[PDB]
């Protein structure tokens, strides 16, 4: 229960300075305590609560987004973005005369939204059972999770394997029934599932020989999360559509959006114009300001220049702890792995509860940090300073140590 | 693009009376400076609401207490979401998953009406009845059916309304006997259809439908995205047409337009079940779409119930609006003036006594809408059907304003066509 929140810190009803390593929900990229936003909202509510903010917002988004992404359809949340995506991908092919080409393909343990459509896309089999949630035209392949899937196959080789999974499904369904393939650059919600560096190279190959669109879900990855403006350009992907949201406002306003490549855009706008526009004047004003800040203060550049590479090595230095098996780390996102043993490699029995115990103990020490099973993940704001990465390593250290004896002693 | 009260000024100092409440949303009118203060306030504190680490004074707490006060007695639990179109995607999920936990997983069908609107997501455009939306790919997703709209004008213009009302409402019973009673999960409708012209049902309809949903074993879902927060002169159209809905999405009006908000009111009946086994029903959004949105909305309702905007609607200015409007029924092109509370429609026809609709009525309405704003009125058209939802802060001197601008507009379209 916080009472004060600025910079990378919160403050309980007790007054401990808890450091938000998670950045709320992966989204307060420019950090708490920016009154510069709250004023642009105040004065945008004076002007108009309905409908200008949508235009200046669209300008900045075409500057920061590479490639042929020059048009943008805003929405209320990234959960609604993926809906528009699915709809306009089938609409794309329908306006090409291939209306049977409507099958979009996700991965297992990927997250793409809470809406019926987004949840059908999202591969959390927890969300899928409750009501009918594999709405016709969504398929689920393997995730490029090295640790979990094949912890001993060579990353170089395991990587090719998890992408040709895509090609396997394609040849299974009918290349002409597949509309597109969608996937987070790095699955965030389902733990930090970083793919090997052979994965996206093959995906790009499959999405060229087999005529499908690539859709890349940049909701957690967008707006600096990987030390680049988008996970897109950090893996040299040239997507056809990107749902952007959490980063947009840095977490202060409900705004979602889809970036569209000129390929899909042209057909949708020219041979269509019947699919109305924009999002919400307030939240757009607010969003366009958070990007001004990030652009002039360059804290996206600082994100790569200074605080990322430092935060990678330091995190990797956590991998030697007795509990830590793997120490994944790309840009301002990273993750550890809680295993009973490393040399014998015994995967913790029900690691859900043990990782839930480090989270529980991580705030007792004064660190925000998410568990997902036996995976401790972090996603600090892009304003975190090189000094505070040391605050982070230190408070994780005590936590893992405390839990190293807590299961190997107290009520084992 | 500046706005003050019920007026939208633009570049050339053009005071345009907004008779559309933007999009049925801006209810307490524009230029309520005290909402900006509550957004500036909350925005300065935390901007998320996870079960680990809450806020000082959680806004969704205040809000969800208030929504219990102004909603039908038996509704007392509110999930929040990002917009009202999200609210229905939730409801589709809830109504179904309600039966799975009553052990009837084959009970997954939702029935709507054609030309009903229910969101713009893949499910809200499946639910919704315009086939424009259905034709993109195949937006009708399984589980949904559609029955006939009780649109007395375009369906059976000469029938007896209480007869026809009773006839379009046996439609529901006649989809159940075609579908199988144990398959149907629920039936969802707006108290009055909004975005598809204002389809004011014959009084004898909601009477019947409540019976059909007693006799049959189905939940009920009343879409109050538009009818909610005073539109019908009652807080919710439910109270207007004495409906007791098991779910109810709410939205446009929750924040009177000021902030992206959605929400679903769960009747005690369905709530009892979705709580016993609800650890499974844990999704990313959970509740509290945004503390800032909730903070703003909570104050919005403060302003609404304390100055009394809902009450002076259905008791003072709504009556006035209805009377004035119907003085337009006595016009050449106009061959019906309907409305309730704070919503109203004019039908345009090529001849009154020979009831003769236009070859392509849509285009005439586009003209009228183009001619309304020219003369200084926001007035939307659904085909050949003009509609209006003025902000509930409307003053009498301004429905007078609202009527005369309509009069010119109708007299200029009458010229233009002839």
Numbering used by the authors:
A (entry chain D): 36 to 86, 95 to 318, 323 to 459
B (entry chain A): 38 to 455
What does the literature reporting this entry say, word for word?
Herein we present the development of a PluriZyme, TR2E2, with efficient native transaminase (k cat: 69.49±1.77 min−1) and artificial esterase (k cat: 3908–0.41 min−1) activities integrated into a single scaffold, and evaluate its utility in a cascade reaction. The reaction proceeds through the conversion of the β‐keto ester into the β‐keto acid at the hydrolytic site and subsequently into the β‐amino acid (e.e. >99 %) at the transaminase site. In addition, we report the crystal structures of the TR2 enzyme and the newly designed TR2E2 PluriZyme. It presents the typical type I fold of class III ω‐TA observed in known structures present in the PDB database, and it contains the characteristic pyridoxal‐5′‐phosphate (PLP)‐binding domain composed of β‐sheets and the catalytic base Lys289.
